RNA sequence: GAACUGGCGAUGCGGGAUGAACCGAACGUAGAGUUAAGGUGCCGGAAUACACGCUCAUCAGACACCACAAAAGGUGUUAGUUCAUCUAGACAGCCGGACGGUGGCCAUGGAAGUCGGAAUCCGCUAAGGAGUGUGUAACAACUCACCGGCCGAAUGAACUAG
């Protein structure tokens, strides 16, 4: 007897939603949307991450599901304080995306000796798993 | 307020003492048929199937125009007209007598019965009646004694009328179809 | 051409022994380089007053800078241009971040909707409108209200690699 | 231009209900069920609280936003049909040659035959589809009534019949004998 | 036919189904970085990135001279110019307006809103016309015009060019 609809809930653009960039000068540093002009162009800030304040096209930016309360038309001195107060890094790094990023970075950065270590340890893990899997 | 007084603050204010009620609806009839009989005592009849100016009426609310209008109060959708008449109905059958030369109706509407009236000679020439190929009128003449060969029925009720079939057929000075009653209410308080 | 700049220019129309100290004319113009900026300034001066490049001087050039690049701004713009049948006089408004970006967007919009190349456009003025309830057009009056919550669906994203196993989706 | 977000409210009473898949919609009520596929424009639906479904779209031209109210009309009309029923009364008219209409079942098909239409003498057949029925109107001369739940099926059937009863090669405004609709309403009244 | 320069049967080709005459360009053998008046998914030697628009076309459209379109137009789509109304709240959910002239003239038994020819205002001032069409070759002529019943917000008209 219910009128069920699934959710129809996707990620939006709105003052407060932290974002991430993929290509440009900064290249891969979180930032906070502060204002919005039109469908494509906005200005973002990420002073604690070290990026200057400027305007970027949304096609050049990637979104995130984190957010927090912001006032419109703020500036660096306010957005940095609100960023530090909300403490987004307490949960962003905990999320299951920055962990994969760090995994990619370490796997790309490690060298030959560590590779041989990982090889022998992978043999160890394979042995241990297949032991318990064979009998049951 | 310059022009509105001539309708509201003049006519209605000088005749805010009426208690008659003649509610009629022109659904589909020859308008002048009802119009002239509402008139004849001309100057006391005017159709006013109105519009929506009651927001302004409530803004200027102090009318008390027709307290007997509380019957179709949930009918705010194409309401009847605020018309003012106080005529009698015992006049046509005694005062006016022997008119008998009024105008016929639209000439073309559907008749109730299938009738063929006998035609009398007059001594005129045939006119522009060479349009009958479809159904026609099969007739024969022999010095007055006319003879119809076959009969035709053209149409029934519930259909619209043609375009060029009302010229020189009904030459008896008769209204083909008025003969009806169309009225919603006729009351006095 | 390139990304736009804009300069203030001041000319003088060089003096004469019998009439020294002229009136000193100023303009502010949008361009890409100082050379073409002063050239187009001289062009407008040719059009609007009697003077010739062989009988004048540029007494100053300065590459000014917008004050507050952080503040999103509502800029009204007036323009006069020529088309394939006749001339016109148009007025528009844009929500943007700075005047150089405003003019850069304006030129693309005019080339879009009127085929007006750079050789047939000249701006009359670009001014700011500061308060609300003063814009006119319903392609910029939208973003003034509170809470501009909306997605941009169908997030496409390319691939540096040419092949792919997983048959990707377009969630967002 | 570019209406960034535009929506429309749609109500639903308490007796009926609806279930929306990714793209399919399925209404259910006392009179019966109904389904429909919306793989045409792909606009969003959002529940509020058991009575208010908001249809919504973001970023489009007038051609893209017209489909929004179009689908609103489609859904609210079809739920009105399944919660209230639809009916179409059509009439016969004949000048001199009276019509002869009949219903005939064969192989679970249920066709309709028309005869004596301007003097034809071999069958004028027309089929009928499910979800709709017909009864010859008693106590009234020369009418027929369709009655069903959906609207697209019954309107298409009535239009098919009133188009099949067509004539050519005769006078273009003297002959007006055929079948045509007359009334469009509901199986119930004021509910 | 001819002036000006750059071109010619006898004068070496990028662009295309070729080259006097479609731009005319001046020539060593192995020997730099760019192009002579260039485009890049493939006819392949090279970037399937960046910002707004028409684009459904049931004959789309594609790069100079070069191999093509105008009668007359489009509530088809975007962007403008101008003019009048709106929270003193109008549009799209139905109506009709016939008082005097409308019985206005052609060898004194008949011509009721112009078959053969002139003219369209007044006192009236929410109704309140001698009428675009109008039954015997008018006497018996109907349809329509600032006005009037709930809700509640942008709409209406004329032009301009992609």
Question: Which key features would you list for this structure?
Answer:
4 chains; A: alpha+beta; five-stranded antiparallel sheet; extended; D: 191 residues; alpha+beta; Outer Surface Protein A, domain 3; 2 domains; four-stranded antiparallel sheet; 19% helix; elongated; RNA-binding
Protein described:
The structure is cut from a larger assembly and holds chains A (136 residues), B (189 residues), C (172 residues) and D (191 residues). Chain A is an alpha+beta fold. Chain A has helices spanning 76-86, 89-92, 98-109, 112-135, and strands spanning 18-21, 31-36, 41-46, 51-57, 61-63. The termini of chain A are far apart. Helix content of chain B is 12%, strand content 6%. In chain B, the strands form 2 sheets. Chain B has a two-stranded antiparallel ribbon. A two-stranded antiparallel sheet of chain B has the order 2-3. Chain C has 2 domains: 3-69, Ubiquitin-like (UB roll) (Roll), CATH 3.10.20.10; 70-146, Ubiquitin-like (UB roll), CATH 3.10.20.10. Chain C has 2 helices and 6 strands, in the order E-E-H-E-E-E-H-E. In chain C, 10% of the residues are buried. Chain D has 2 domains: 1-85, Outer Surface Protein A, domain 3; 86-191, Alpha-Beta Complex (Outer Surface Protein A, domain 3). Helix content of chain D is 19%, strand content 37%. The interface between C and D is small, with 10 and 7 residues. Chain B binds one RNA strand of 162 nucleotides through helix 1, helix 2 and helix 3.
Break the fold down into its secondary structure elements and pairings.
This is part of a larger assembly, with chains A (136 residues), B (189 residues), C (172 residues) and D (191 residues).
Chain A: E1 18-21, E2 31-36, E3 41-46, E4 51-57, E5 61-63, H1 76-86, H2 89-92, H3 98-109, H4 112-135
Antiparallel strand pairs in A: 1-2, 1-5, 2-3, 3-4
Chain B: H1 7-14, E1 20-23, H2 31-38, H3 54-59, E2 139-140, E3 147-148, E4 185-188
Antiparallel strand pairs in B: 1-4, 2-3
Chain C: E1 5-11, E2 25-31, H1 34-48, E3 58-62, E4 73-82, E5 87-96, H2 99-113, E6 121-129
Antiparallel strand pairs in C: 1-2, 1-3, 4-5, 4-6
Chain B binds one RNA strand of 162 nucleotides through residues 3-4, 6-8, 10-11, 25-26, 30-33, 35, 42-43, 46-57, 59, 75-82, 101-107, 122, 124-125, 127, 166-171, 173-174.
- How large is the share of residues in beta strands of chain D? 35-45%
Helix amount of chain D: 10-25%
Radius of gyration of chain C: 22 Å
Largest sheet of chain C: 3 strands, antiparallel
* Beta-strand content bin of chain C: 25-35%
Largest sheet of chain D: 4 strands, antiparallel
Round the Cα radius of gyration of chain D to an integer and report it.
Answer: 21 Å
Count the domains of chain C: 2
Organism (chain A): Saccharomyces cerevisiae (strain ATCC 204508 / S288c)
GO molecular function (chain A): RNA binding; structural constituent of ribosome
Family (chain A): Belongs to the eukaryotic ribosomal protein eL14 family.
Subcellular location (chain A): Cytoplasm
């Amino acid at each position: 007897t219910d009128s069920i609809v699934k959710a129809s809930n996707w990620r939006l653009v709105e003052v407060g939603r932290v974002v991430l960039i993929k290509k440009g000068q900064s290249a891969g540093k979180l930032a906070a949307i502060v204002e919005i002009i039109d469908q494509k162009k906005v200005l973002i800030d990420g002073p604690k991450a070290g990026v200057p304040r400027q305007a970027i096209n949304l096609g050049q930016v990637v979104l995130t599901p984190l957010t927090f309360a912001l006032p419109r038309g703020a500036r660096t001195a306010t957005v940095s304080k609100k960023w530090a107060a909300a403490a987004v890094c307490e949960k962003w790094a905990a999320s299951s995306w920055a962990k994969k990023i760090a995994q990619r970075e370490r796997r790309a950065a490690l060298t030959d000796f560590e590779r041989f270590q990982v090889m022998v340890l992978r043999k160890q893990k394979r042995y241990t798993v297949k032991k318990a899997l064979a009998k049951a | 307020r310059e022009k509105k007084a001539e309708y509201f603050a003049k006519l209605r204010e000088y005749l805010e003492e009426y208690k008659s009620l003649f509610v009629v609806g022109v659904d589909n009839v020859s308008s002048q048929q009802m119009h002239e009989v509402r008139k004849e005592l001309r100057g006391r009849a005017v159709v006013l199937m109105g519009k929506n100016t009651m927001v302004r009426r409530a803004i200027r609310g102090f009318l008390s125009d027709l307290p007997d209008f509380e019957k179709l109060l949930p009918f705010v959708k194409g309401n009847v007209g605020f018309v003012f008449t106080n005529e009698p109905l015992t006049e046509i059958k005694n005062v006016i007598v022997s008119n008998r030369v009024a105008a016929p109706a639209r000439a073309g509407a559907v008749a109730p019965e299938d009738i063929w009236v006998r035609a009398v000679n007059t001594g005129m020439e045939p006119g522009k009646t060479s349009f009958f190929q479809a159904l026609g009128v099969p007739t024969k003449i022999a010095r007055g004694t006319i003879e119809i060969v076959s009969d035709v029925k053209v149409v029934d009720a519930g259909n619209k009328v043609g375009q060029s079939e009302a010229s020189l057929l009904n030459l008896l000075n008769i209204s083909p179809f008025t003969f009806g009653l169309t009225v919603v209410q006729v009351y006095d308080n | 051409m390139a990304h736009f700049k804009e300069y203030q220019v001041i000319g003088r129309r060089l003096p004469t022994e019998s009439v020294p100290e002229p009136k000193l004319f100023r303009m502010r113009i949008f361009a890409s380089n100082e050379v073409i900026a002063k050239s187009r300034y001289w062009y407008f001066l040719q059009k609007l007053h009697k003077v010739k490049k062989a009988s004048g001087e540029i007494v100053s050039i300065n590459q000014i800078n917008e004050a507050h690049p952080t503040k999103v701004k509502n800029f009204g713009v007036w323009v006069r241009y020529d088309s394939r049948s006749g001339t016109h006089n148009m007025y528009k408004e844009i929500r943007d971040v700075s005047r150089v970006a405003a003019v850069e967007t304006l030129y693309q919009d005019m080339a879009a909707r009127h085929r007006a190349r750079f050789r047939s456009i000249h701006i009359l003025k670009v001014a700011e409108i500061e308060k609300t309830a003063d814009v006119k057009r319903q392609y910029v009056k939208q973003f003034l209200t509170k809470d501009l919550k909306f997605p941009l669906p169908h997030r496409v994203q390319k691939s540096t690699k040419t092949f792919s196993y997983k048959r990707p989706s377009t969630f967002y | 231009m570019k209406y960034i977000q535009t929506e429309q409210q749609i109500e639903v009473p308490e007796g009926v209900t609806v279930s929306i898949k990714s793209r399919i919609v399925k209404v259910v009520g006392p009179r019966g069920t109904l389904t429909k596929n919306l793989k045409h424009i792909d606009v969003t639906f959002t529940k509020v609280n058991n009575q208010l479904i908001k249809v919504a779209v973001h970023n489009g031209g007038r051609k893209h936003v017209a489909a929004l109210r179009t689908v609103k009309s489609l859904v609210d009309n079809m739920i009105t049909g399944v919660t209230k029923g639809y009916k179409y009364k059509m009439r016969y008219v004949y000048a001199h040659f009276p019509i002869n209409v009949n219903i005939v079942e064969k192989d679970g098909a249920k066709f309709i035959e028309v005869r004596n239409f301007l003097g034809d003498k071999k069958i004028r057949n027309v089929p009928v589809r499910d979800g709709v029925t017909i009864e010859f109107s008693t106590n009234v001369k020369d009418e027929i009534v369709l009655s069903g739940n959906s609207v697209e099926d019954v309107s298409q059937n009535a239009a098919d019949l009133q188009q099949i009863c067509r004539v050519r090669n005769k006078d273009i405004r003297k002959f007006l004998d055929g079948i045509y609709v007359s009334h469009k309403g509901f199986i119930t009244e004021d509910l």
